[PDB]
Write a protein that binds this ligand. Structure first.
Ligand code: HEM
Length: 154
């Protein structure tokens, strides 16, 4: 798939808002993922023992993780589709060290879209959400192809 420049502009315009508070958005997204799909919390060995949302909000380790996820995703989105180099190390560690099925990447995509919709309603109307969904679908498709080359396809 290929996004048009106008679709990339819609994605990078909300993303510029997210970047005003990377840690806050990282927390919101990972908490929305873990509450919605608790099975995903089990993959994180540093924070899989957290039992409530209040504990999640207070966890410094979860907040650092969130910043790591969003910073790596933001670098991929700014490439506007030319992300081959960035995707290699990410696909290798998530397929052979962490073992993250593609399904879980769908779940976090859903959490990203939920949080942007709640926090940025004016910059995340239907056309901007469709463009972000296309950008995350592109990311998932390219990672799934790399998973396959690596021998995992999860
Ligand atoms: C937007 C998608 C994602 C991005 C951009 C992302 C990026 C990262 C980055 C940059 C790291 C640290 C470097 C590395 O290990 O590769 C990381 C670590 C990790 N990721 Fe992801 N990730 C994504 C989705 C996920 C999902 C959906 C899960 C699990 C349900 C996951 C589980 C992990 C785990 C278990 C680690 C190691 C955490 C620790 O240090 O103990 N990742 N991820």
């Amino acid at each position: 798939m290929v996004l048009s420049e106008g679709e990339w502009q819609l994605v990078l315009h909300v993303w510029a808002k997210v970047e005003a508070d990377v840690a806050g958005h990282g927390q919101d997204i990972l908490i929305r993922l873990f509450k919605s799909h608790p099975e995903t919390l089990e993959k994180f060995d540093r924070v899989k023992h957290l039992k409530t949302e209040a504990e999640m909000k207070a966890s410094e380790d979860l907040k650092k993780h969130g910043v790591t996820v969003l910073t790596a995703l933001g670098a991929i989105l700014k490439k506007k589709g030319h992300h081959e180099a960035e995707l290699k190390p990410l696909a290798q560690s998530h397929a052979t060290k962490h073992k993250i099925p593609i399904k879980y990447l769908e779940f976090i995509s859903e959490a990203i879209i939920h949080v942007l919709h709640s926090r940025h309603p004016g910059n995340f109307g239907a056309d901007a959400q469709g463009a972000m969904n296309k950008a995350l679908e592109l990311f998932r498709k390219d990672i799934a192809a790399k998973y396959k080359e690596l021998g995992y396809q999860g």
